Amino acid sequence: DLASLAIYSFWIFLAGLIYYLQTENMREGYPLENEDGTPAANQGPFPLPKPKTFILPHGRGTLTVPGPESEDRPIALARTAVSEGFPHAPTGDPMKDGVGPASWVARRDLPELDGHGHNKIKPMKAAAGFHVSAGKNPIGLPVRGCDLEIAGKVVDIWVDIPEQMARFLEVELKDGSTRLLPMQMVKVQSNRVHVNALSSDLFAGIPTIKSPTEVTLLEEDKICGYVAGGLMYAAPKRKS
Amino acid sequence: AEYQNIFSQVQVRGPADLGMTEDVNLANRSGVGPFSTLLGWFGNAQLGPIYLGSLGVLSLFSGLMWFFTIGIWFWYQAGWNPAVFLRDLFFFSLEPPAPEYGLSFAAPLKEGGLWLIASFFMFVAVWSWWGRTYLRAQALGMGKHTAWAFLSAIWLWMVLGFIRPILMGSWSEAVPYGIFSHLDWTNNFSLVHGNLFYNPFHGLSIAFLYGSALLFAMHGATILAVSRFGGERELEQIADRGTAAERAALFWRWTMGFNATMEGIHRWAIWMAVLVTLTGGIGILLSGTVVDNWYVWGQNHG
Amino acid sequence: ALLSFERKYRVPGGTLVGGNLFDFWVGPFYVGFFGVATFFFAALGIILIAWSAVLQGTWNPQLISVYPPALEYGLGGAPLAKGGLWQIITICATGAFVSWALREVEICRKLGIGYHIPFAFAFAILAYLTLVLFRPVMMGAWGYAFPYGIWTHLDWVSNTGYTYGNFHYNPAHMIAISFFFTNALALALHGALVLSAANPEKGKEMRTPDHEDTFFRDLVGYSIGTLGIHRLGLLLSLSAVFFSALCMIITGTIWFDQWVDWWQWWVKLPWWANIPGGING
Ligand code: BCL
Ligand code: BCL
Ligand code: BCL
Ligand SMILES: CC[C@H]1c2cc3[nH]c4c(c3C)C(=O)[C@H](C(=O)OC)c4c3nc(cc4[nH]c(cc(n2)[C@@H]1C)c(C(C)=O)c4C)[C@@H](C)[C@@H]3CCC(=O)OC/C=C(\C)CCC[C@H](C)CCC[C@H](C)CCCC(C)C
Ligand SMILES: CC[C@H]1c2cc3[nH]c4c(c3C)C(=O)[C@H](C(=O)OC)c4c3nc(cc4[nH]c(cc(n2)[C@@H]1C)c(C(C)=O)c4C)[C@@H](C)[C@@H]3CCC(=O)OC/C=C(\C)CCC[C@H](C)CCC[C@H](C)CCCC(C)C
Ligand SMILES: COC(C)(C)C/C=C/C(C)=C/C=C/C(C)=C/C=C/C(C)=C/C=C\C=C(C)\C=C\C=C(/C)CC/C=C(\C)CCC=C(C)C
Ligand SMILES: COC1=C(OC)C(=O)C(C/C=C(/C)CCC=C(C)C)=C(C)C1=O
Ligand SMILES: CCCCCCCCCCCC[N+](C)(C)[O-]
Ligand SMILES: CCCCCCCCCCCC[N+](C)(C)[O-]
Ligand SMILES: CCCCCCCCCCCC[N+](C)(C)[O-]
Ligand SMILES: CCCCCCCCCCCC[N+](C)(C)[O-]
Ligand SMILES: CCCCCCCCCCCC[N+](C)(C)[O-]
Ligand SMILES: [Fe+3]
């Protein structure tokens, strides 16, 4: 019967398809590893796929996956147990160390570029002629931490130019330096910007950017990781 | 509460974005449309530009001819009365030829001929639009994934209105143009074939349709959950994995014991969606040509 | 057991109940208190299903079916063998689903990500619960819920739909369907757009988000953008499910006839109800 052949054939196709999809999805993070970093004995039934190579634009080179992997950064964590499957506890300040929900990844230390080779993310003052088009303009507002103290003031918005979107607020601290606060982690109110993730004491600790008019992928990760990290790690002073 | 990233808190605007050039014939591109602040709370504010070109003109003209052919039939069925037109709008139907006309293009205008004409226009509308999804990708040096995926929807559409009717030997099998009548046709199609719930290709199609909503809810919520680390910037996460993509993967690995990559989730996405109409088309194509009655077939598998 | 990048995230904390009591992993899977709760509810549920299968006299997964209490029981208890098992399994399923969501919440907390995923999963749970709990309660009997069986749940969809004629005419069902269809279209288009950019013509550089915006504007004159598409996928799939639940909760509680009749309200508006011609005159 022809419908029978069709349905039996489709299920064979589907097994094939799932195999292809699962392997494609092992281009990153594999082989699996014991908690001490050695290759795990059990890798499961799907093999790693044949490598593929991405040609990155703007002469930024190439990426081949899968390939040799390492963290390229130290991890201030220690085992809490002899057997596997238990948590690794921070050996220092998890926020400063960039571990747990404060983790960051060693991305390129160059800014993301747009389709024409220009920096994707720019302070609005440098982005011609961008402006706030709707909603409360946060520039000039005091920035409040979860402890309800003022940590600084908003001096600009960093905008994703190709997507025309607010990506960070630039906040000026008491000492006249600035930090970037992720737009996803701030609440713009009528008389203030409120940051739930950080108490005022924690803003100085936000990682700084190397040049004041651009931000690199590495720096975004460190900044984002750190701010998110405060939801778990600044919970002593919160009290939201 | 804090920010949930469903709606933006602050919109910013700059010069209209006229887009990448590559091999695009820029003379065929319109200018920007207006900016929609309302849209801008959720997605992008900018409308346009659009690429036109010859294929697009053919496609839009053909598509309008399809629409107007149906609409004039409706005006006719309404006795040219605008009040009747509005009252009975969902009840009007442009129906295919009766079975006795078979595949004949000699069906009377008011008895299936106009359906054939409307159908000719739809056929070229859709196939020229397909050409378009291919050429627009090509002009930009892009892969042809869009045109490939569209082909799966076109397969179901083709099976319903063209392939199945030809294999059955009459246009009367095809779907009529009307709001309610297309529903009645769907109901009736299942009744006449012994209930589509016994068609294993209809059950697959459903698994994939439900699966599509499951997977887009998952992916969409995941990306928004890690948007605080730039997770929506997916192309750069592919080229240079970040903590967004890592936390995304680990949420799922810890939840259900496996996970995707930033690129690979988009392969799960595209296949989940295309499989809806791939399986559906097969299920419909086999109905009446090979299997009269799905209940009966299920009792046998023969 | 660990992805190459994973160890830095496997820190303590994030739990909602029990402190560090269950703060550990089994292979890839995180446990947590709600991991243990999921196991308890699911194991109990499956054991009761197995019991039900014994009382039904079958092990065939195509045949096993667990039915809610007959309508005569109304909203009270029923003998285990006559609907009471369905009632306990329903509590276990709910407990298991809610536990699974709360486990996801613990996982979100440890990873420091937003709560969007369990929030979305909760729409699925609320739709399940519309069918087995809210709707039956509003209608006055457990027996209006669907039965737990692979083929019998389909009997139930068919019989319930046809109780109201062609169920296609339920207007909230129309909207749900439009959301389902549109969700699938957007899913196909999102997966395809990203992939077309990441995997360009042979030998070319990866395209950028700007090329994605450009392709779609060239095609349809608009691009919702990267954040927008992920917001949209979520709205479409959750709206689908919201309207599914809506379409059922109103059926047999405020609407009782053939849904096709509901549309008469528009046809019978007094300014055109009696004009001759067209379909309805
Ligand atoms: C949604 C509105 C209707 C509905 C009407 C339809 C229709 C119509 C069809 C199905 C079909 C399916 N339904 Mg149903 N079904 C109902 C709600 C349920 C519920 C529930 C609320 O708990 C469940 C678990 C299922 C599950 C099932 C699957 C057996 C099957 C494919 C679904 C799918 O791929 O989804 C998408 C999600 C995924 C792809 C994730 C995979 C999860 C699936 C595969 C889990 C199935 C487990 C199942 C065997 C139960 C075992 C539980 C154990 C005891 C632990 N239905 C309600 C009453 N359902 C199809 C079928 O083929 O049935 C024979 C079908 O044609
Ligand atoms: C009484 C009714 C019958 C029924 C009979 C039918 C029939 C008949 C069919 C389905 C089909 C399907 N059914 Mg069923 N179905 C039953 C009840 C169910 C139930 C349920 C009970 O909960 C569910 C969830 C489903 C769900 C489904 C889907 C999985 C599937 C449609 C996929 C799709 O995306 O099509 C939508 C997508 C398309 C049709 C593709 C359109 C393609 C393009 C080219 C459109 C171009 C448009 C353009 C020209 C106009 C645009 C205008 C703009 C302004 C520009 N059915 C009952 C038993 N069902 C279809 C199928 O495949 O079955 C196997 C089908 O033919
Ligand atoms: C003859 C049949 C009637 C019919 C009568 C009905 C009836 C009756 C109903 C629908 C409902 C649906 N119909 Mg209808 N409808 C028909 C024709 C169609 C057609 C079509 C193309 O013709 C389509 C597309 C649809 C589609 C729709 C959807 C809007 C909706 C189902 C999705 C849903 O509720 O999700 C909601 C999602 C869920 C319920 C899933 C939740 C499960 C979760 C919480 C967890 C389960 C996990 C666990 C068990 C898995 C095990 C773990 C494993 C390891 C994997 N119908 C015809 C006219 N329709 C249903 C509805 O709206 O229900 C609310 C419904 O009850
Ligand atoms: C994998 C299966 C899923 C899917 C995927 C899919 N659909 C596709 C494609 C893909 C990948 C797209 O590439 C293609 C697309 O371009 O999307 C934006 C498309 C598409 N799917 C569409 C619809 C659609 N898809 C369907 C669903 C599905 N598509 C499946 C669920 C359905 C359902 C569920 O029934 C519908 C209705 C279109 C938006 C688009 C195909 C475009 C097309 O073929 O157009 C031809 C017709 C015209 C060019 C003009 C028609 C005119 C209109 C009748 C109204 C007139 C208004 C006019 C537009 C205004 C202009 C007037 C000016 C002169 C002022
Ligand atoms: C709201 C939008 C869509 C959506 C959302 C959604 N679903 C999701 C998620 C979200 C975002 C979760 O994060 C969660 C997940 O972890 O996914 C991988 C999930 C999930 N959705 C799932 C299934 C599912 N979702 C469905 C639908 C949808 N999911 C909506 C369309 C459907 C359909 C359409 O029928 C199915 C079947 C699972 C894969 C997963 C949740 C898994 C889970 O809660 O597991 C814990 C419990 C068990 C392992 C088993 C418990 C067993 C019970 C005690 C007994 C069984 C009784 C049951 C009622 C019998 C049913 C018999 C049927 C034949 C009727
Ligand atoms: C206000 O009035 C005006 C006139 C101004 C405008 C209003 C117009 C109106 C009211 C139009 C209404 C449109 C409606 C109701 C359309 C509904 C369409 C629906 C529901 C279609 C659903 C299914 C359609 C399918 C499956 C079509 C299949 C078509 C094909 C596969 C084409 C097959 C090709 C054929 C038969 C031609 C044969 C020749 C070749 C090319 C070999
Ligand atoms: C591949 O990603 C996609 C986009 O491309 C970046 C789109 O933008 C759209 C279209 C989105 C909407 C809501 C149109 C509504 C707004 C208007 C023009 C009135 C869809 C579906 C999509 O899948
Ligand atoms: C509906 C799709 C079903 C997908 C389930 C199969 C894939 C899960 C297996 C992944 C194994 C995880 N591992 C060991 C590779 O890390
Ligand atoms: C499927 C999404 C539909 C998108 C429709 C977008 C409207 C196109 C209008 C853009 C044309 C710009 N303008 C006014 C200069 O022609
Ligand atoms: C992207 C791949 C995901 C695959 C999901 C497969 C779900 C299987 C659903 C069972 C359908 C049963 N039926 C009626 C066709 O026999
Ligand atoms: C079609 C639904 C079937 C559900 C089965 C769930 C698949 C998840 C497998 C991932 C587990 C990998 N493993 C065994 C190494 O842990
Ligand atoms: C209460 C619903 C019925 C329980 C079904 C038992 C679960 C076994 C897994 C599904 C079996 C797959 N298959 C193809 C044999 O049907
Ligand atoms: Fe995505």
CA distance A206 to C1: 33
Tokens of C66: 């667990």
H or E element at residue C57: none
Query: What count of residues does chain B have?
Result: 302
Tell me the residue type at B169: G
Longest dimension (CA), chain A: 81
> Which whole-number Å values give the CA distances from A20 to A16, A188, A207, B146, B210, in the listed order?
6, 45, 41, 20, 22
Residue C216 touches chain A, beta carbons under 8 Å: no
Which helix or strand (DSSP H or E) is residue A160 part of?
A: strand A150-160
Ligand 10 pocket test, pick from A7, A14, A24 with the greatest ligand atom count within 8 Å of Cβ, gives A14
Contact present, B44 and C212 (Cβ < 8 Å): no
Atom of ligand 6 nearest to the CA of B115: 36
H or E element that contains A154: strand A150-160
Q: How many CB pairs under 8 A join B and C?
A: 324
Based on the fold, state whether residues A102 and A112 are members of the same structural domain. no
Q: How far apart (Å, rounded) are the C-alpha atoms in residues B125 and B120?
A: 9
- Rounded CA-CA distance B55/C66 in Å is 57
- Provide Rg for chain C, Cα atoms: 25
Nearest by CB to C195, from B145, B236, B239: name it: B145
If asked whether residues A15 and A88 sit together in one domain, one would say yes
**How far apart are the C-alpha atoms of B185 and A222, rounded to whole Å?**
58
How many CB pairs lie under 8 A apart between chains A and B?
167
Cβ atoms of residues C92 and C55 within 8 Å:
no
In this structure, are A127 and A207 located in the same domain? yes
3-state secondary structure of C66: strand
Quote the tokens at residue B27.
């003379």
Q: Are residues A116 and A217 in the same domain?
A: yes
First to last CA, chain C: 71
Total count of domains within chain A = 2
Query: Does B70 contact ligand 6 (Cβ within 6 A)?
Result: yes
Burial A114-134 (b: 16+ CB within 10 A, else e): bbeeebbbbbbeebeebebbb
Residues A144, A62, single domain; the answer is no
CATH number at residue A29: 4.10.540.10
Structure tokens at B129: 């639009």
CA torsion sign, A35 to A40 to A43 to A44? negative
Domain end among A62, A83, A106: A106
CA distance A41 to A43: 6
- Examine the domain organization and report whether A27 and A99 are in the same domain: yes
Task: Calculate how close chain B gets to A176, using CA atoms only, in Å.
Answer: 25
**Is residue B62 lining ligand 2, measured as CB closer than 6 Å?**
no
* CA quadruple B76, B81, B82, B87: dihedral sign: negative
A59 is in which domain, residue-wise? 2-106
Q: How far apart are CA C188 and CA B270, in angstroms?
A: 5
Ordered by where they begin, the domains of chain B are: 1-143 (1.20.85.10), 144-302 (1.20.85.10)
User: Percentage helix, strand, coil, to 5, in chain A?
Assistant: 25, 25, 50
For residues A204 and A145, membership in a common domain is answered with yes
Distance C122 CA to ligand 5 centre (A): 10
8 A C-beta contact, residue C212 and residue C221: no
C154 Cα: distance to centroid of ligand 12 (angstroms): 14
Burial of C269 (0-12, 13-18, 19+ CB in 10 A): exposed
Domain termination residue (choose one: A56, A78, A106) = A106
State the greatest distance between any 2 C-alpha atoms of chain B, in Å, as a whole number: 68
Q: Contact partners of C by the rule of 3+ C-beta pairs under 8 A?
A: A, B
Q: Are residues A131 and A53 in the same domain?
A: no
CA distance C190 to chain A (A): 16
Quote the distance between the C-alpha of residue A17 and its chain's center: 31
In a shared domain, residues A229 and A126? yes
The CA distance from A191 to A137, in Å, is 11
Phi, psi of B209 (to 5 degrees): -75, -50
Residue corresponding to tokens 């560090």: C20
Last-in-domain residue among A47, A77, A106: A106
Residue A170: strand pairing partners: A156, A180
Q: At A230, which CATH number?
A: 3.90.50.10
Domains of chain C in sequence order? 1-163 (1.20.85.10), 164-263 (1.20.85.10)
**Interface with B, mutate which of A105, A118, A192 (most B CBs under 10 A):** A105
Return the residue in C3, C4, C108 with the most chain A beta carbons within 10 A, the one to mutate for interface testing: C4
How many whole angstroms separate alpha carbon C224 and alpha carbon A165? 12
To the nearest whole angstrom, how far is the Cα of A200 from the nearest Cα of chain C? 20
Task: Indicate the pairing of strand A121-123 with strand A52-56.
Answer: unpaired
Give the tokens for residue C5: 């990048």
Whether A112 and A228 map to the same domain: the answer is yes
Closest CA to C9 of A205, A35, B28, A7: A35
Alpha helices in chain B (DSSP H): 37-40, 53-77, 82-87, 113-138, 145-158, 164-168, 179-192, 200-225, 234-239, 243-256, 265-286, 294-300
One-letter-per-residue 3-state SS of B63-86: HHHHHHHHHHHHHHHCCCCHHHHH
CA distances from B269 to B151, B197, C215 (A): 16, 25, 19
**Nearest ligand 1 atom to alpha carbon B203:** 66
Q: What secondary structure letter does DSSP report for A182? A: E
A115 and A204 both lie in a single domain:
yes
Contacts of A159 in chain B (CB under 8 A): 12, 14
- In a mutagenesis test of the C interface, which of B76, B255, B294 is the best target, namely the one with the most C β-carbons within 10 Å? B255
Q: How far is CA A203 from CA A184, A192, B77, in A?
A: 16, 16, 71
Residues A58 and A131 both lie in one domain: no
Upper half-sphere CA count for residue B123 (Cβ side, 13 Å)? 12
